[PDB]
Design a protein around this ligand. Structure first.
Ligand SMILES: [Cu+2]
Length: 124
């Protein structure tokens, strides 16, 4: 299955946001990160991906499709806007085995608030 996440200068949640900021997919599914506004990319947050998963980092303004195979929760960020809270979470499969690990990772304050909210929204 093929999902979309938009990268925006502003949204419901404030400035510099992924929409949706939380997404549940199945192993083998894809997500395309879409540059609705210029100046954004997507990068896994180091330390916030499941055992055996590969890190990734797209180019600014790249329409970037990623296939998620390793089950677990993945924290993602926009490289330039991370400190300003531009983050998201993708959960792959049920019963993520790395939830408390991800819940405990340290991030910029504005990013941490949005990560916490995205994790809550996933029912974690
Ligand atoms: Cu950005």
């Amino acid at each position: 299955a093929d999902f979309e996440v938009h990268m925006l200068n502003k949204g419901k949640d404030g400035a510099f946001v992924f929409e949706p900021a939380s997404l549940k997919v199945a192993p083998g599914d894809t997500v395309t990160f879409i540059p609705t506004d210029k100046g954004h990319n997507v990068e896994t947050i180091k330390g916030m991906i499941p055992d055996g998963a590969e890190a990734f980092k797209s180019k600014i303004n790249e329409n970037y499709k990623v296939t998620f195979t390793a089950p677990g929760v993945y924290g993602v960020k926009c490289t330039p806007h991370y400190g300003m809270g531009m983050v998201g979470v993708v959960q792959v499969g049920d019963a993520p085995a790395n939830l408390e690990a991800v819940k405990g990772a340290k991030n910029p304050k504005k990013a941490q608030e949005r990560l916490d909210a995205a994790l809550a929204a996933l029912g974690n």
